[PDB]
Specification:
The structure is cut from a larger assembly and holds chains A, B and C.
Chain A: H1 9-16, H2 18-22, H3 25-37
Chain B: E1 2-4, E2 16-18, E3 33-35, E4 60-62, E5 75-81, E6 90-95, E7 100-104, E8 114-115, E9 128-130, E10 139-141, E11 143-144, E12 151-153, E13 161-167, E14 170-174, E15 180-184, E16 188-191, H1 207-212, E17 266-268
Antiparallel strand pairs in B: 1-2, 3-4, 5-6, 5-8, 6-7, 9-16, 10-13, 10-16, 11-12, 13-14, 14-15, 15-17
Chain C: H1 4-10, E1 11-14, H2 18-27, E2 29-34, H3 40-50, E3 55-63, E4 67-69, E5 74-76, E6 80-87
Helix pairs in contact in C: 1-3
Classes of the chains: A mainly alpha, B mainly beta, C alpha+beta.
The structure holds potassium ion (18 copies) and magnesium ion (59 copies).
The structure holds two RNA strands.
PDB class: ribosome
Keywords: Antibiotic, ribosome
Entry title: Clindamycin bound to the 50S subunit
Chain lengths: 45, 271, 88
Amino acid sequence: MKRTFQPSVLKRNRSHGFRARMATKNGRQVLARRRAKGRARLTVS
Amino acid sequence: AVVKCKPTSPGRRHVVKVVNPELHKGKPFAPLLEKNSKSGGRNNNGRITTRHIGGGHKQAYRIVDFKRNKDGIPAVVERLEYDPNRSANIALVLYKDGERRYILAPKGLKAGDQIQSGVDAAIKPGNTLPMRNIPVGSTVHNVEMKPGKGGQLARSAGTYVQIVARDGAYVTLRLRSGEMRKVEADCRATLGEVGNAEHMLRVLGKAGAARWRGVRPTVRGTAMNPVDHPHGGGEGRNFGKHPVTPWGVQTKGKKTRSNKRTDKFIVRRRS
Amino acid sequence: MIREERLLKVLRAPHVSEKASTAMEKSNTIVLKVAKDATKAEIKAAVQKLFEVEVEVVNTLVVKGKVKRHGQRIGRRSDWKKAYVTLK
RNA sequence: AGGACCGAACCGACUAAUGUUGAAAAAUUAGCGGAUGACUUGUGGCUGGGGGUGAAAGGCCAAUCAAACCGGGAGAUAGCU
RNA sequence: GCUCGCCGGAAGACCAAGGGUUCCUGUCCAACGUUAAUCGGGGCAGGGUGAGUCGACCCCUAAGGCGAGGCCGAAAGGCGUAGUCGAUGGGAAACAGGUUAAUAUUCCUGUACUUGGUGUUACUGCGAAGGGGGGACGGAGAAGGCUAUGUUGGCCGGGCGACGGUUGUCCCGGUUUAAGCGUGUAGGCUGGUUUUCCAGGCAAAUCCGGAAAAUCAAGGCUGAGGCGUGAUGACGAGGCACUACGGUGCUGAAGCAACAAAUGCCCUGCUUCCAGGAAAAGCCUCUAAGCAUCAGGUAACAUCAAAUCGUACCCCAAACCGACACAGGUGGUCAGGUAGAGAAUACCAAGGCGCUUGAGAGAACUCGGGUGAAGGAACUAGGCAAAAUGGUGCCGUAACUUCGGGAGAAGGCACGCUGAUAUGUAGGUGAGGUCCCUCGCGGAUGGAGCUGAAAUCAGUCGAAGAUACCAGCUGGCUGCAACUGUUUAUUAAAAACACAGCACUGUGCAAACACGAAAGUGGACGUAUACGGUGUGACGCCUGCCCGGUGCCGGAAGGUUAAUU
Ligand SMILES: [K+]
Ligand SMILES: [K+]
Ligand SMILES: [K+]
Ligand SMILES: [K+]
Ligand SMILES: [K+]
Ligand SMILES: [K+]
Ligand SMILES: [K+]
Ligand SMILES: [K+]
Ligand SMILES: [K+]
Ligand SMILES: [K+]
Ligand SMILES: [K+]
Ligand SMILES: [K+]
Ligand SMILES: [K+]
Ligand SMILES: [K+]
Ligand SMILES: [K+]
Ligand SMILES: [K+]
Ligand SMILES: [K+]
Ligand SMILES: [K+]
Ligand SMILES: [Mg+2]
Ligand SMILES: [Mg+2]
Ligand SMILES: [Mg+2]
Ligand SMILES: [Mg+2]
Ligand SMILES: [Mg+2]
Ligand SMILES: [Mg+2]
Ligand SMILES: [Mg+2]
Ligand SMILES: [Mg+2]
Ligand SMILES: [Mg+2]
Ligand SMILES: [Mg+2]
Ligand SMILES: [Mg+2]
Ligand SMILES: [Mg+2]
Ligand SMILES: [Mg+2]
Ligand SMILES: [Mg+2]
Ligand SMILES: [Mg+2]
Ligand SMILES: [Mg+2]
Ligand SMILES: [Mg+2]
Ligand SMILES: [Mg+2]
Ligand SMILES: [Mg+2]
Ligand SMILES: [Mg+2]
Ligand SMILES: [Mg+2]
Ligand SMILES: [Mg+2]
Ligand SMILES: [Mg+2]
Ligand SMILES: [Mg+2]
Ligand SMILES: [Mg+2]
Ligand SMILES: [Mg+2]
Ligand SMILES: [Mg+2]
Ligand SMILES: [Mg+2]
Ligand SMILES: [Mg+2]
Ligand SMILES: [Mg+2]
Ligand SMILES: [Mg+2]
Ligand SMILES: [Mg+2]
Ligand SMILES: [Mg+2]
Ligand SMILES: [Mg+2]
Ligand SMILES: [Mg+2]
Ligand SMILES: [Mg+2]
Ligand SMILES: [Mg+2]
Ligand SMILES: [Mg+2]
Ligand SMILES: [Mg+2]
Ligand SMILES: [Mg+2]
Ligand SMILES: [Mg+2]
Ligand SMILES: [Mg+2]
Ligand SMILES: [Mg+2]
Ligand SMILES: [Mg+2]
Ligand SMILES: [Mg+2]
Ligand SMILES: [Mg+2]
Ligand SMILES: [Mg+2]
Ligand SMILES: [Mg+2]
Ligand SMILES: [Mg+2]
Ligand SMILES: [Mg+2]
Ligand SMILES: [Mg+2]
Ligand SMILES: [Mg+2]
Ligand SMILES: [Mg+2]
Ligand SMILES: [Mg+2]
Ligand SMILES: [Mg+2]
Ligand SMILES: [Mg+2]
Ligand SMILES: [Mg+2]
Ligand SMILES: [Mg+2]
Ligand SMILES: [Mg+2]
């Protein structure tokens, strides 16, 4: 059966990538939270 | 011509087609085409703002000359054409200077007919004049509401306006709605009725024919749940409320015109 | 003209393998490990200057580094560029 | 010609049996409907939570829906166990 | 290794997406692998991905995104102009053969092609962010011409048969060759040329559009395939030298024809229909400002350049999505034989597999199947399930009907094989040859050869000839819904939703209405034959009475009545 995760790198990057995060105030707050937590990987990039 | 289809399948039984042999079989005049991509009735917020719009056939926009401002220069009708964007047919006209334009095709217009715009034009179907230069009682179409703006009234197939009176700066027009409306006498109008009056005798015959025209299904409010529509709900077919729009406004008689700016120009409401 | 300083950095090592040896004997082609950012023009100029030979053509590829283990630890070897340098 | 007919691909999902700590958190097998269309499908895009979208079933909106998910107010409050 | 079985419109092959070393080699068997494992997609090490031409990048745009200024908004921000991004679309060019353990249109061999720079030479109006052309477009259908491809014959090589027969009307195998270049054919489209003039193409134009003459009537464009060359080559059944028994090395015959034939190509065509079918650049052409014995353009020749990144491997799957080596899901491409209408189905080819526990036994019972005396729905909520029907041709076919239907109604008959008609017919194809002849990819006339149904008559085997697989059960009465559609992903597919049609009602355009503190945007580049809302639901015959209540619409004398004063 068709499951929910149908991978596309282009859609992944456009939806959740670094530049998508940087494009809005709220995306930049995601990055700030992830840096403050000290994530090794900030984004799907 | 109005042609009944034979009932060779249930979807054809009720089809009534308006078949016009005069219309150009070939392609439109490419310099007056533009792309016109579809909205689905969605605005720039991406939200449906007009329901029941979607799909249907791809359509190129024909640039129609509603202004008819190219005065003094005769034009000959080259051909009538189907326009998917409107009920009326359009005429490709060739001006004597080599310019081609599309106009709304008036009733009776055919290839070879000569048309002209301006103050000095003949009172003939397809000629465009300021309405101060058109006799009172004339039937006109493609009527401007402001001088130089382009025709906005009586553009649909079979429609026309009657110039009922002329009083100084203004003419009184009887619109197809039955409304009596004042417009400035400098506003242009094209003599005659819009052609393709048989348009309204078409019978689509099947659900799919409406889908081809980009009309999606209307779901009745009473078929919904209360959360969705005021009419929604009930165990069985129930109603028991005053009919309203999906947004709760009475939809059987309640007047919604509210334009104090333009009230001065309305002599008599359609009533 | 590419500077000698650049040319002295682009060639990293001769690549030793059966395919490299076969390339040498059968097609007069030397196989080199070259700088990741080395272009075909730079590799050509470097080989001609430093090894004092006439280069017909350079073909290049990037070898992706292998993911490896060293205990309970995942590492990755570096990507590197390989040049097939056909001599005249 | 056809929202025409019979019928594969393709799209569905009417019946039955099986399976029900499954081969599978919805399938398999035998039959079944549509199959040039209001068809179907790839890629990309847009609509965002009292909001969307809905040929309308309160359906669907990431195995979640009469108000998604995540974090926060937060140790809500719990005359109850 | 031999045999057996299974798939073969796939369970083969090639990809995209996704994954990321899973690829190849050596080595190891703890763990992983539902068992063992010497094996592995497992561990460890090493190797492996070669491009001007394939793809990306790149140029160009779609939806859409972002968006200098701008407009708007407590702030955050929203919208949007110029722009700038954004493929799933448009835009230059490479093929065959050989080769690695593992890459190959990338390496090698052979033979090509494209774009751009630079220089030289000859000749020349060049010049864009501007104009025009082009690019550039739908559905359906039909037929012709083809090719891929297949079949058969010929040809060439080999064979003479484990058991009766097999020197033949016998058996087996092969019979392949590209891009490019040249040629210009079946076909498709279009009248051609010159001169003059011009309220159009924001200015200009020699271009496009328009007008008017004259002249010639046959010029142009487009185009599959074929043919020639590419190729005195390559490949080639097999054979012969060597064998690390994995394969290397050498050599090499024929290499034609006929017929059949696509869903591919001509064809972005043609015909036809209505629902009326992207954009922008590359490209072609025109000029402007400007530049002028210069730049620049065109052509030839030479030369240089064409970077960078991807390229292994899986890819209907044990490598992707499903926690699994999971009966699930996953877009594109390729399309052999016999039978067949067929991409169904059966059996096979190429190719790939036997699904990672086996061994016995032959109880109940469960599952999946086969057959069943007599009966035949008595079963049961219900014929649930099963059984049955099932093809083609022909005959024949009721009520009712909106005249289409109902209808494949129903029901019935024939059906294999052999021979003859006819050593193979009707039909298709079409050579030699002979004519005409612009003179060839040409007619015309011939019918050699090839292919080839269908029928009739006669005979003949079986219980049975649509023999398997495959493949409608049929009829009668009636409720509901006109119909095709749609729906509760995962217990409801329906009488529910939708629907064409109908009506009421709003809406005069800065429309009503909707999204939005707003700007705006949708409605619509629409304009009352239009658009929104509501109810009804094809069609036929119709749709009665009630305005007291509640809405809505209209009215405004009078009563009552806000801020305010
Ligand atoms: K129209
Ligand atoms: K409805
Ligand atoms: K209701
Ligand atoms: K909802
Ligand atoms: K109800
Ligand atoms: K209900
Ligand atoms: K909510
Ligand atoms: K074992
Ligand atoms: K390249
Ligand atoms: K690049
Ligand atoms: K024998
Ligand atoms: K080529
Ligand atoms: K050739
Ligand atoms: K490769
Ligand atoms: K792939
Ligand atoms: K019934
Ligand atoms: K159903
Ligand atoms: K009343
Ligand atoms: Mg509507
Ligand atoms: Mg309706
Ligand atoms: Mg309901
Ligand atoms: Mg409500
Ligand atoms: Mg009731
Ligand atoms: Mg009641
Ligand atoms: Mg090379
Ligand atoms: Mg490369
Ligand atoms: Mg049908
Ligand atoms: Mg469904
Ligand atoms: Mg099934
Ligand atoms: Mg049916
Ligand atoms: Mg069918
Ligand atoms: Mg309910
Ligand atoms: Mg869900
Ligand atoms: Mg709530
Ligand atoms: Mg609190
Ligand atoms: Mg608590
Ligand atoms: Mg590994
Ligand atoms: Mg392996
Ligand atoms: Mg084990
Ligand atoms: Mg052991
Ligand atoms: Mg391994
Ligand atoms: Mg390319
Ligand atoms: Mg914006
Ligand atoms: Mg700004
Ligand atoms: Mg844009
Ligand atoms: Mg761009
Ligand atoms: Mg693309
Ligand atoms: Mg390989
Ligand atoms: Mg088409
Ligand atoms: Mg052929
Ligand atoms: Mg012989
Ligand atoms: Mg014998
Ligand atoms: Mg087809
Ligand atoms: Mg590969
Ligand atoms: Mg397994
Ligand atoms: Mg699987
Ligand atoms: Mg599929
Ligand atoms: Mg076959
Ligand atoms: Mg099959
Ligand atoms: Mg048993
Ligand atoms: Mg049985
Ligand atoms: Mg019995
Ligand atoms: Mg018996
Ligand atoms: Mg019996
Ligand atoms: Mg009986
Ligand atoms: Mg009975
Ligand atoms: Mg009984
Ligand atoms: Mg009983
Ligand atoms: Mg049954
Ligand atoms: Mg059965
Ligand atoms: Mg009853
Ligand atoms: Mg129905
Ligand atoms: Mg149905
Ligand atoms: Mg359900
Ligand atoms: Mg169901
Ligand atoms: Mg507006
Ligand atoms: Mg109803």
